[PDB]
């Protein structure tokens, strides 16, 4: 079987202390990245899951290891798909990293524990963000069943089924699994192949890249004579990248501080590409690929490349300070444990506006019926339209209000 990188981005959502990283470990094998220098930029893990089906039974055909000795048939497995995991945070404060991960994703995996309460505030907030940013391919997973009884787990299923009625998603598959015990993983791998079709993705579309994480490979003990370039942990949704192409990071750079700054987007050339495990020349869109650029390892250290757009040379994305948004408000607030009715937007108020991956604090200038004018403190770029989820300060930390679209 030939070595191939990620084809579709599949994420995992749940709640705190459930064990989302243990679920990722049970499916793939390699443990989470977060658990100082390398990887650390946004709260997300990295593990690649292998799907090889033995068609020489039913659900047990899709296996973790490529060599088939487990299901019964001595014949070797056939290549179907290779997937990448982008684990999103399940916390009320960490909202910008969740919405940044949702734009990267194409399919979702929901985790609800048996022993805990049925209506959870964070999972409903993740479900609302899925409905906003178009991620309808959702598989519901039960986290812990062995602590629960025979009838109580069935009653918990009935409460989940009654909860999913008014939402847009109608047909979502439900699987009972365990992370520590390691069971029924083969059924989930079967559902990933069947229920989720890969969207049409072509060579024709102009190259665009979204940077989430920042890698710097500087080793203790090793001298300055051998240095590695600043690798950007970015995700591609459109346009095929290869080795030896010019890249500009759009929003801007702070290098010089009376007067004015007149700086271009950060120019860099691709040196190395990191995909799956081994070195590869081509970058297939629909997966997290570590693009090793000429940009300094000091710039790709920690918290500098969190939600920044990248365009290829010969293309001009526009930089905006005043953005025109077409907003729609929900009935009641999602995320809070008391649920309150969403009030009308007041002029001049700080709101965390997440345009795909960019985290910006924006002030409302004019209030209308459907449209709103917003002024950004830090510049954010717009390419086409981009899916936006709005969040506001009402009670202590940030709470989601609704969805928005740029009309430019």
């Amino acid at each position: 079987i030939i070595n191939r990188q990620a084809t579709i981005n599949i994420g995992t959502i749940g709640h705190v202390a459930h064990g989302k990283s243990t679920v990722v470990r049970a499916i793939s094998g390699v443990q989470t990245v977060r658990f100082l220098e390398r990887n650390i930029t946004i709260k997300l893990g990295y593990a690649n899951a292998k799907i090889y089906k033995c068609q020489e039974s039913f659900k047990s055909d899709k296996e973790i290891s490529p060599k088939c000795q487990r299901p019964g048939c001595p014949g070797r497995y056939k290549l179907v798909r290779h997937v990448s995991f982008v684990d999103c945070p399940g916390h009320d404060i960490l909202m910008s990293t969740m919405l940044s991960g949702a734009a990267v994703m194409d399919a979702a995996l929901l985790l609800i524990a048996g022993n805990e309460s049925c209506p959870q505030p964070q999972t409903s907030e993740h479900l609302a963000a899925i409905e906003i940013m178009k991620l309808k391919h959702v598989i519901i997973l039960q986290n812990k069943v062995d602590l629960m009884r025979e009838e109580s787990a069935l009653e918990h299923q009935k409460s989940i089924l009654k909860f999913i009625r008014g939402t847009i998603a109608d047909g979502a598959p439900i699987v009972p699994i365990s992370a520590q015990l390691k069971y029924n993983i083969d059924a989930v791998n079967e559902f990933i192949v069947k229920t989720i079709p890969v969207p049409p993705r072509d060579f024709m579309i102009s190259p665009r890249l979204i940077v989430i994480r920042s890698f710097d490979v500087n080793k203790p003990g090793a001298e300055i004579e051998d240095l590695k370039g600043g690798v950007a942990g970015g995700s591609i949704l459109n346009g095929v990248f290869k080795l030896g192409d010019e890249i500009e990071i759009r929003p801007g750079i702070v290098t010089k501080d009376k007067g004015k700054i007149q700086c271009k987007p950060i120019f860099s050339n691709i040196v190395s590409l990191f995909a799956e495990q081994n070195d590869l020349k081509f970058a297939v869109p629909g997966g997290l690929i570590g693009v090793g650029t000429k940009v300094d390892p000091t710039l790709c250290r920690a918290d500098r490349l969190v939600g920044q757009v990248v365009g290829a040379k010969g293309h001009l994305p526009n930089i905006y300070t005043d953005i025109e948004i077409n907003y729609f408000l929900l009935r009641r607030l999602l995320g809070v444990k008391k649920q309150a009715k969403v009030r009308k937007l007041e002029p001049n108020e700080v709101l965390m506006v997440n345009i795909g991956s960019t985290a910006t604090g924006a002030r409302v200038v004019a209030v209308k019926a459907d449209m709103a004018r917003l002024q950004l403190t830090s510049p954010a770029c717009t390419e086409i339209n981009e899916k936006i989820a709005l969040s506001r300060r009402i009670e202590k930390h940030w709470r989601l209000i609704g969805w928005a679209t740029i009309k430019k």
Partner: peptide, 17 residues
């Protein structure tokens, strides 16, 4: 969909430590 789920749950309860 909650029809093949009940067979998967019964398979899980049968094979436990």
């Amino acid at each position: 969909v909650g029809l093949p789920y009940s067979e998967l749950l019964s398979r899980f309860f049968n094979i436990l430590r």
